[PDB]
């Protein structure tokens, strides 16, 4: 299915939050012409961020997906590449899933000011899906330079509310979209 690129819907541990494969990132990208429709959720399984409270610091971490100029996931990404593939051999290109570098340029007169906001999508998510357990997600397009990436999608996850009773970092699903490179 050339219209869906994903982690598979029920992944094994596939994502580094603190150490490699300590988390399960479920990410599906679906191509709707020139816009990608995405859904993302994160379950931290082991380690520092599996169960959080107010004494865990910092209260944010970053998950980078780094892509080359063919849209292939680079091995330095926090997301393990083993099962990152079209919905059904590692794929050879996925440029049409990549966030536009014209809409969302890599970092570099009022008419020369570059938007610092437009390459980010920021919202609350809710741990365990509970309305009284807000956290946040920041989706960032093409803001990384690591591994000489041509494209990137970064997920920053965190929280700010004071939690004295420890709770699993297990996020509600978040929908977003972005302008595709082609």
């Amino acid at each position: 299915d050339t219209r869906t690129l994903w982690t598979t819907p029920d992944p094994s541990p596939n994502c580094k939050v603190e150490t490699a494969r300590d988390s399960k990132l479920t990410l599906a990208l679906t191509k709707c012409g020139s816009q990608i429709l995405a859904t993302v959720s994160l379950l931290v399984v082991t380690g520092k961020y599996a169960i959080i409270s107010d004494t865990v610091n910092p209260k944010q971490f970053s998950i980078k997906l780094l892509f080359n100029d063919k849209g292939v996931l680079l091995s330095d990404s926090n997301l393990d590449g083993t099962y990152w593939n079209y919905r059904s051999t590692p794929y050879k290109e996925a440029v049409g899933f990549m966030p536009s570098t014209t809409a969302y340029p890599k970092p570099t007169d009022p008419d020369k000011k570059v938007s610092q906001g437009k390459n980010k999508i920021v919202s609350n998510i809710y741990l365990g899906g509970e309305v009284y357990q807000p956290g946040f997600i920041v989706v960032k397009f093409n803001q990384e330079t690591d591994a000489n990436c041509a494209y990137s999608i970064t997920f920053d996850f965190g929280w700010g509310k004071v939690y004295k009773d420890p709770i699993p970092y297990d996020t509600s699903s978040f929908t977003f979209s972005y302008i595709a490179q082609e």
Copy 2:
């Protein structure tokens, strides 16, 4: 694909919050291949939650869409199935649909609910949680929780549940009339 399953865009009262058809649920599910793109909004028209304030309790209610193995709406659902159907223009195909499995939330992504950290099942991923705004006013937050496959009622194969509520103190009564909310989810097929 690219078909829509919906309540019609201008439904008559079609949904139970407290009693049958005491509310207008507008819900459209549009298939974008492996994901469903959805928009939902609720106007409660009569009963306990039509007009809310800080003296209305509890401050949450639940609307269950329960589906069988063909993705057909079960009678126990809060939504009346009379006008829950595939789109035709601004209305519905006349005959009740026979199957809608491609519109169901995946039971692989969102399994039905059932100490080893390695076997932990995500409690978050089957829910989408956000503020909505009553009357579309920025100063009238409430909330929506969309839940996939979390019901057991009527031996459903699939479910979509909408929990609506609010937390802010409203001393003056206001209608429970939500801003539209967009979400997507992984489709069963």
Copy 3:
């Protein structure tokens, strides 16, 4: 499955307070009977370019007004020069399939034309969310998207973006929004 858009890296193309004082980036993509949209706003000069608690009002309104063919009316805050389908071209002739449904989101009615037997939703034609200035989690603002709620220019359809904030900002910050995704039911 076409996209109607401002182009992804627009030149100043929008009036918040004065012509060309802002850059609105907006893409509408058709997915059958729903439009999938992404929007963001960079105010580049004037009252709302750098905001703080001493600026009032703390909301402003960007109207996209369309005629019966889905064509952008020049009265809109958005300049229509580069509002067109994604692809040297011609202004588009029709985009009704991209308009917000007037059955889902009807225009306001008069005392004359209001049916007292029907309760009309005031919320359903609005989408309301936070956006974040600079994409910083500690700089919330808000966006309100409104469908078909204008009467300006005898529009057949409209999409209105209200942007604002409520948090007290002592130190001034640029009104430069994170991107916001939404969808709506299309006219056809």
